[PDB]
Curated annotation (Swiss-Prot):
It comes from Homo sapiens. Signal peptide: none annotated. Detected in erythrocytes (at protein level). A dimer in solution, but in its membrane environment, it exists primarily as a mixture of dimers and tetramers and spans the membrane asymmetrically. Component of the ankyrin-1 complex in the erythrocyte, composed of ANK1, RHCE, RHAG, SLC4A1, EPB42, GYPA, GYPB and AQP1. Interacts with STOM; this interaction positively regulates SLC4A1 activity. Interacts with GYPA; a GYPA monomer is bound at each end of the SLC4A1 dimer forming a heterotetramer. Three SLC4A1 dimers (Band 3-I, Band 3-II and Band 3-III) participates in the ankyrin-1 complex. (Microbial infection) Interacts (via N-terminus) with P.falciparum (isolate K1) aldolase FBPA; the interaction inhibits FBPA catalytic activity. It is linked to Ovalocytosis, Southeast Asian: An autosomal dominant hematologic disorder characterized by ovalocytic erythrocytes that are rigid and exhibit reduced expression of many erythrocyte antigens. Clinical manifestations include mild hemolysis, intermittent jaundice and gallstones. However, the disorder is most often asymptomatic. Spherocytosis 4: An autosomal dominant form of spherocytosis, a group of hematologic disorders characterized by the presence of numerous abnormally shaped erythrocytes which are generally spheroidal. Affected individuals have anemia, jaundice, and splenomegaly. Clinical severity is variable. Some individuals are asymptomatic, whereas others have severe hemolytic anemia requiring erythrocyte transfusion. The lineage of its organism: Eukaryota, Metazoa, Chordata, Craniata, Vertebrata. N-glycosylated. Functions both as a transporter that mediates electroneutral anion exchange across the cell membrane and as a structural protein. Component of the ankyrin-1 complex of the erythrocyte membrane; required for normal flexibility and stability of the erythrocyte membrane and for normal erythrocyte shape via the interactions of its cytoplasmic domain with cytoskeletal proteins, glycolytic enzymes, and hemoglobin. Functions as a transporter that mediates the 1:1 exchange of inorganic anions across the erythrocyte membrane. (Microbial infection) Acts as a receptor for P.falciparum (isolate 3D7) MSP9 and thus, facilitates merozoite invasion of erythrocytes. Acts as a receptor for P.falciparum (isolate 3D7) MSP1 and thus, facilitates merozoite invasion of erythrocytes. The gene is SLC4A1. The modification N-acetylmethionine is found at residue 1. The modification Phosphotyrosine is found at residue 8. It is found in: Cell membrane; Basolateral cell membrane. This is Band 3 anion transport protein.
Length: 15
C-alpha cells in the first residue's frame, strides 16, 4: 500500500 517496498530504497530509480 506504500510505494517503498523491500528490494527498494531510492537508488533503483534510474535504470
Amino acid at each position: 500500500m506504500e510505494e517503498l517496498q523491500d528490494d527498494y530504497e531510492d537508488m533503483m530509480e534510474e535504470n
